[PDB]
Design a binder for this molecule. Structure first.
Ligand SMILES: Nc1ncnc2c1ncn2[C@@H]1O[C@H](COP(=O)(O)OP(=O)(O)O)[C@@H](O)[C@H]1O
Ligand SMILES: Nc1ncnc2c1ncn2[C@@H]1O[C@H](COP(=O)(O)OP(=O)(O)O)[C@@H](O)[C@H]1O
Ligand SMILES: Nc1ncnc2c1ncn2[C@@H]1O[C@H](COP(=O)(O)OP(=O)(O)O)[C@@H](O)[C@H]1O
Ligand SMILES: Nc1ncnc2c1ncn2[C@@H]1O[C@H](COP(=O)(O)OP(=O)(O)O)[C@@H](O)[C@H]1O
Ligand SMILES: Nc1ncnc2c1ncn2[C@@H]1O[C@H](COP(=O)(O)OP(=O)(O)O)[C@@H](O)[C@H]1O
Ligand SMILES: Nc1ncnc2c1ncn2[C@@H]1O[C@H](COP(=O)(O)OP(=O)(O)O)[C@@H](O)[C@H]1O
Ligand SMILES: Nc1ncnc2c1ncn2[C@@H]1O[C@H](COP(=O)(O)OP(=O)(O)O)[C@@H](O)[C@H]1O
Ligand SMILES: Nc1ncnc2c1ncn2[C@@H]1O[C@H](COP(=O)(O)OP(=O)(O)O)[C@@H](O)[C@H]1O
Ligand SMILES: [Mg+2]
Ligand SMILES: [Mg+2]
Ligand SMILES: [Mg+2]
Ligand SMILES: [Mg+2]
Ligand SMILES: [Mg+2]
Ligand SMILES: [Mg+2]
Ligand SMILES: [Mg+2]
Ligand SMILES: [Mg+2]
Lengths: 132, 132, 132, 133, 132, 132, 132, 133
């Protein structure tokens, strides 16, 4: 029912668009004000914040959210540190988007419940679409 | 049951791996010899070729393959050129991976039959997966 | 007659100077404010704008003008994007300068109405001039 | 009608293709062998040579040719040097392609009879086509 | 006194040369072979290995060593992965070199016992030397 | 005591913060205005200047300061140039940060009094620290 | 007695300084204002002008000057064009500095009386000083 | 007399040709094999080597040659490193080419014996020659 999306790039904005269209509460958070404004029309609440900051994550009651999506791709350290801070905050399920295999390995060892690699996973999906 | 995959990045090798795992015969083509070498381990046949060159595509006989997947991600110019050359060669079905919506619309004008945007499509898929 | 010329390099400023000398009112658009300044001296109206942006092109009201000339030479990606946005804007006639045969074919697929290859067309003209 | 084209670029090939179709003899010269092979099937004679080499220009006997077209654009210094050597060789009329206004100013002082600026010249022609279309 | 040093850059080789001069057993591990050859003259044992490989770290048997120094600076992700792999292997104390504050905070969160930032720490020590 | 620190990277700002915390007046000089602003909060006086410029250094009056620390790390040419200009300006004690053994020897020839290698010296220090 | 120097780079300024020491009138002219100010204290008259401008060269009566030195190095086209304009200006003796062998070929044919190639010419003398 | 010239640009190849034309044996060293091949035509021995590397310079035995000319122009870092390594090797006389006054002063501190500025010294000579003195 209630979801949080951290990082509002192309991937995260798509997650927010689908989640809200399905009829759920989505807290969209991105350090960049332009993307938060872009996603403000779609999501229930759009907040400009740095999720690498521990006190900001404490203030945003992410432990109350059923699922938290971390969609930071460019800076691997940002995604790893956001995952660590979210896990320390008490978030039970953390979904993290990873662009590289080393990042996926690190995130798996940290404790992310779901690691999403968009290029490989769509590779498999479109291969299955081509087969049938 | 014969497919051609152009570009052997994370998406292209994932489509090849899945297509060859499902029994189909894949021709992997890329300009980077390292990725052609790593794909040649499992693909039916792997070729180091430039797919933006008209005569090279004629040598590859891409018109024989029922589906041609173009997975050139970083070089949008190369992706557009490869789609144009494949369409003018006589390929019935051309699937193209596009990074952004503008490239997707240009590819729609070119004649690409299926256009895959990995980030947005994974956003939609992951949102549906988290919903239920 | 109202004309819009996008890109003010050697070809774009030559088309504007000819169009305005012939008594026509031309709009000169370029991202380089330096080149917009020379045009503003003799051009009915000169604007510093990015013509690959959909909202910017909507602001320019290019659909009012009879013909839109896109003279972006070095950046082929910008030329393709500008032609696509102009066609999507709703301009009746688009003339695009293309420095490559492949770019010309892509622009034909996009929807450009007249495509000028200055080097090849000038070569044909010079050959005809020497013959006669 | 006997012509010579030096520099088989995009501009150079366009001149070579149009000249042969009418039925005039064309000599195509380019330093790069690959471009010479491209015009080999579109000209009377295609020769790989360096046209800034003074002795080579003498061997080609460019003074026999009615018109010579120098179509070197990327290196401004070669086009200026080739123009001077062609003029010293005794060629009556030399047509030179200039990409920049600074290059065209030098070529006028050098003695080129016709300076072609494809971007500026096609800009005027295209605008006149827009006027009456 | 038995030590292990991972990464044989300028910093790592300096820790290996001081440790060997003081008379203690040092294991020098580096992915690059010629740096291993450079350090082989000093250390008791120099091994060319990849320390982001779990099985390789298991074969190296690092839990015997009193202290393990991870001195990988250029790629932050490799340093984080090696640190967490060594922690999972059962190393009692892990000392990690960090070049950035983001890397240092990530390493602090993942469980590094000592984080060394050579620029900041040497800055403090040099200022103290200047004072007296 | 008055100290001048040139270059405000990780090493230079650490020396300034340590020097100023002990009651000494520090002059912080850098070409990057962002780091000069960051240092200006706690540094007695901060100046945006190019210290390879010999006329600029005369304006800074570096001859007055007891010790001049040059902490230019990435630009080695700027490091030797600043050391040379400081020596020619009549500075009694010049401390220079060097990133390589070859740069250190050139700085010794120039006239630097103390040369600090952050990676090598901190490596020796941590090697001693683990032993004891 | 009376000389003119066009271009006040490192080479041109060196000519002006030595010419003044022998008690000769020198007209130092350069497009860049800063370089003219440097030679203002070393020449009889220092003028900021563009010597590529034909009318400007007409005003600066260079035909009265015994020798004119063109010392433009970076832009090959300016030195060639300035040399020609000086020839129509009536300058009997024109000395031109050339940095490349191809430029020295053009300058010889256009009529430069003396072509100076500082690297090649200094190469010959330094060898002679080494021999004796 | 045996000379060593490091760097085979315009200045370096001009010094080698004059030193070999005067009957002396020159060792031309450069990292660019293309320029080493050009010098190998007339110099006694030409070697492709990196002269900022201590072991490489020890292999060249530069201490044998009485004069070593370092003619690295664009890379000031390489010029300074080569001067330092040649001086440490034990070369009695090191001549270095410098582009600016700051590089020249650094090379003076390094230990270069003669420092040549091509532009400034050529300007001085051109002034003297125009003065006809
Ligand atoms: N510390 C952070 N806190 C919150 N959002 C962040 C943080 N760091 C980056 N982001 C956001 O995550 C988004 C994902 O970035 P990225 O994957 O590079 O998408 P894009 O390639 O479109 O920029 C960025 O737009 C950025 O604004
Ligand atoms: N003209 C071309 N012809 C064939 N393959 C190409 C061409 N241009 C790029 N490629 C390949 O397409 C692959 C996908 O590109 P890229 O997205 O950069 O890789 P990744 O998916 O790893 O990010 C690259 O590995 C590249 O080698
Ligand atoms: N997105 C854009 N919108 C408008 N003008 C553009 C855009 N991108 C490039 N231009 C301009 O279009 C012109 C293309 O000409 P170009 O070939 O770059 O220069 P020239 O013809 O002078 O050699 C330039 O003035 C360039 O700045
Ligand atoms: N010295 C020379 N003699 C003869 N031909 C030359 C010489 N230098 C250049 N050329 C030719 O002139 C042609 C000009 O091509 P150009 O259009 O400038 O190349 P590009 O299309 O890469 O810009 C080149 O194809 C080149 O082969
Ligand atoms: N996966 C790995 N396993 C072991 N050693 C590694 C690994 N990755 C990098 N290294 C080593 O760590 C060292 C880090 O040194 P670095 O700080 O990069 O020195 P420099 O900055 O001079 O390159 C490198 O010498 C490299 O060989
Ligand atoms: N010529 C110069 N004059 C003054 N400061 C300089 C000069 N060149 C570089 N610096 C400064 O020295 C600082 C240290 O450089 P660098 O090592 O690149 O940064 P960091 O130490 O943060 O990695 C830089 O912040 C830079 O602004
Ligand atoms: N058209 C011109 N008229 C006068 N002086 C010029 C002109 N073009 C260049 N110069 C000057 O000629 C000098 C030659 O400098 P040059 O060696 O080309 O460049 P740099 O100063 O970067 O070394 C410069 O001081 C430059 O300002
Ligand atoms: N580390 C090095 N060891 C030996 N030779 C070098 C080194 N670095 C540069 N050189 C050579 O010094 C020569 C000086 O060339 P440069 O001055 O850049 O070109 P030019 O002399 O044509 O202006 C270059 O040809 C280069 O190959
Ligand atoms: Mg994104
Ligand atoms: Mg990919
Ligand atoms: Mg143009
Ligand atoms: Mg061409
Ligand atoms: Mg290192
Ligand atoms: Mg630093
Ligand atoms: Mg200069
Ligand atoms: Mg040189």
């Amino acid at each position: 029912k209630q979801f949080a999306v951290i990082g509002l790039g192309r991937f995260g904005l798509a997650v927010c668009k689908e989640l809200q269209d399905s009829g759920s509460q989505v807290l969209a958070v991105d350090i960049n004000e332009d993307r938060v404004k872009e996603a403000a029309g779609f999501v229930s609440q759009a907040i400009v914040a740095n999720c690498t900051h521990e006190e900001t994550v404490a203030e945003l009651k992410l432990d109350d959210y059923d699922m938290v999506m971390i969609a930071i791709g460019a800076d691997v350290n940002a995604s790893i540190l956001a995952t660590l801070i979210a896990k320390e905050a008490g978030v039970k399920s953390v979904w993290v988007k990873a662009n590289d295999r080393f990042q996926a390995r690190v995130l798996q060892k940290i404790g992310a419940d779901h690691i999403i690699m968009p290029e490989r996973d769509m590779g498999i999906r479109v291969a299955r679409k081509m087969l049938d």
